[PDB]
Amino acid sequence: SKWTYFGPDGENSWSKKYPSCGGLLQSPIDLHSDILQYDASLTPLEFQGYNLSANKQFLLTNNGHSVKLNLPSDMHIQGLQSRYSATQLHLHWGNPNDPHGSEHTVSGQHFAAELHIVHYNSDLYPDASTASNKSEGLAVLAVLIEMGSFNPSYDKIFSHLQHVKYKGQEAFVPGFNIEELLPERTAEYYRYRGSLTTPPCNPTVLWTVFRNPVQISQEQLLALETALYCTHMDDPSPREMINNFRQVQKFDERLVYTSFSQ
Amino acid sequence: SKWTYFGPDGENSWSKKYPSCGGLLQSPIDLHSDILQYDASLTPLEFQGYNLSANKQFLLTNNGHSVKLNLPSDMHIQGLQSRYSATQLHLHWGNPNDPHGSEHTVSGQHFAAELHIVHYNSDLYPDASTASNKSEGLAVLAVLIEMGSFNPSYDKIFSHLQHVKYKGQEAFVPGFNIEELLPERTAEYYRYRGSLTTPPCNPTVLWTVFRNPVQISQEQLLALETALYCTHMDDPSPREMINNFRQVQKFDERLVYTSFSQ
Ligand SMILES: NS(=O)(=O)c1cc(C(=O)NCCO)c(NCc2ccccc2)cc1Cl
Ligand SMILES: NS(=O)(=O)c1cc(C(=O)NCCO)c(NCc2ccccc2)cc1Cl
Ligand SMILES: [Zn+2]
Numbered sequence A, B: 001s002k003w004t005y006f007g008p009d010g011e012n013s014w015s016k017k018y019p020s021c022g023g024l025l026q027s028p029i030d031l032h033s034d035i036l037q038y039d040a041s042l043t044p045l046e047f048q049g050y051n052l053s054a055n056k057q058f059l060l061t062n063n064g065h066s067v068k069l070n071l072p073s074d075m076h077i078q079g080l081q082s083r084y085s086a087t088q089l090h091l092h093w094g095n096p097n098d099p100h101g102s103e104h105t106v107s108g109q110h111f112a113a114e115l116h117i118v119h120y121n122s123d124l125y126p127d128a129s130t131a132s133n134k135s136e137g138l139a140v141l142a143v144l145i146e147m148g149s150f151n152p153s154y155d156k157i158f159s160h161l162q163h164v165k166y167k168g169q170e171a172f173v174p175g176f177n178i179e180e181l182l183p184e185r186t187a188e189y190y191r192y193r194g195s196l197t198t199p200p201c202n203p204t205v206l207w208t209v210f211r212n213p214v215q216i217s218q219e220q221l222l223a224l225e226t227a228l229y230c231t232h233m234d235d236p237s238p239r240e241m242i243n244n245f246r247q248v249q250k251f252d253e254r255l256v257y258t259s260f261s262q
């Protein structure tokens, strides 16, 4: 992975090395009325094993493209047609002079950032790597993040950023209740078939984007936007980890189904 | 002309065969208040030789990507440092289920369609082809189009669409005053340096996007979206010419200059 979000190896070039990035069913997308349709079969998901013990600890890693927290496979979503077990969460964001780095947009507007909690079909596959090539192998929960009030739950992650500033660095984060990262009224969401938003852009993701955003503060966004580097600690051409979101994609005839009718 | 706006040869793959599509200064972009800056240097352009002889005919083609009208080199913009002479106009649009296919956006919003009147620097270069990959080579006037009242002047072009239904087909349009296609208060515009929005995406275009949109009727917009195919007539797999706009590109640490402040 030397793909980036900026310059010659940025997103308009990813398809040169990752053919699925130029394929169908790409994410993210702009959620707007013309392509929305209510589906009453979109019943509420249940979040099981999301309340991670505070006496356990979970690995936080800078992977050169985002900051990721590994999650245990006992954490799962109930309500899809298979069990989906968590593998990791991570974020996408903008930069200090333009804090508008969500991946999905709503009626053309970016949010400040976006959280993805990646799960894989553990009823069918031994791990997320294997699932990532298969029909609906992954399911991602996406939370839109807007600049607002300080959020103590997101700070359980952000308080460790200065320990994972460079590519390959790892830290441990005590467990906390991951459901605290989700917004109000999780029963209201958008659902569509899409892809990884990063290389290798496999069109194998069932996306759930919650309708309501959460808030984190300006100071928490500024920490997220200034603490991290895409490059290793000893790299003589450092690159700040900023603006790590993909532009929205054409719809390719897809609709987005909504669990809310208004 | 192998490139398309859908499937494997769509916009994320243009950079394989057109490397500038993954380079700097790419268009189109979202025009939004954060990145706007009034520049009193931006005085009104003058449109000279736009009242085309009604005794002359201008070639309308379907080139498999848009509908284009050839323009004569006595038509030019005055007001820029060099004289920019017209070569052609063409349009970009969406489709009837999502009729929001402008290239530029304003505060994240697409307009229904967009007209580009392409000019080249004839003081420095002998033709548009030669100018297209050269410094200061091109200048485009962009008009945003929304749905509203019937527009007789756009119908001077739209009435001919049925004769250029398929790729390779051509029709003759009697001269008319191309300035009738411009919006109100053409003194009010956005200006920035960018690129062709189609392959080869050379970063050689000085963009002028007028502030105010024009209106065409619902029937005219439906005709533009439904009249044309990308494919030759005898193609056993026809492809409708719809959604022929490029997604907005990242545009960071840059300004769009405006001729208006209020
Ligand atoms: N943004 S996203 O669409 O939510 C997404 C991102 C990653 C990811 O780790 N990208 C690497 C850069 O941060 C991912 N990785 C899980 C995975 C993918 C392939 C192989 C192994 C693990 C799965 C997904 Cl769905
Ligand atoms: N969308 S746009 O950015 O306004 C633009 C489009 C074309 C164009 O013809 N694209 C082909 C698909 O229709 C162009 N052609 C210029 C050109 C290139 C080579 C030879 C002659 C003319 C110049 C520009 Cl600025
Ligand atoms: Zn992600």
Ligand SMILES: [Zn+2]
Pocket: B090, B091, B092, B116, B197
């Ligand atoms: Zn154009």
